[PDB]
Amino acid sequence: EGRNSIRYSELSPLYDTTKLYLVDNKSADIASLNYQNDHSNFLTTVVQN
Amino acid sequence: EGRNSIRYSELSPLYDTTKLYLVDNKSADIASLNYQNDHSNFLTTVVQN
Numbered sequence: 180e181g182r183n184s185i186r187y188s189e190l191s192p193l194y195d196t197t198k199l200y201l202v203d204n205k206s207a208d209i210a211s212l213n214y215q216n217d218h219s220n221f222l223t224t225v226v227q228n
Numbered sequence: 229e230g231r232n233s234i235r236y237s238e239l240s241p242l243y244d245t246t247k248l249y250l251v252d253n254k255s256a257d258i259a260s261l262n263y264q265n266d267h268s269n270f271l272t273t274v275v276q277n
Binding site for chain 2: 189190191
């Protein structure tokens with residue numbers, strides 16, 4: 180208790196477990212981040228907002 | 229201290245002062261809430277989301 184918080188920068192804090200997703204076919208990332216790379220060396224966002 | 233928090237239902241809490249707005253010409257409220265009333269007896273949203 181107390182030492183179990185998970186804080187994003189402006190939103191309600193969670194506590195003691197969550198999930199994180201690392202998918203490879205989000206449109207905004209296709210457009211900007213990933214132009215010269217492939218499905219084995221890619222770059223993705225962990226923020227879903 | 230401690231007894232000064234302001235809590236919305238899913239967002240970061242504020243502390244010790246804020247503002248609240250009561251305007252009368254928001255589109256969504258024009259459409260739904262206010263159809264049979266006027267500018268002197270009106271109905272508005274305090275949530276801006």
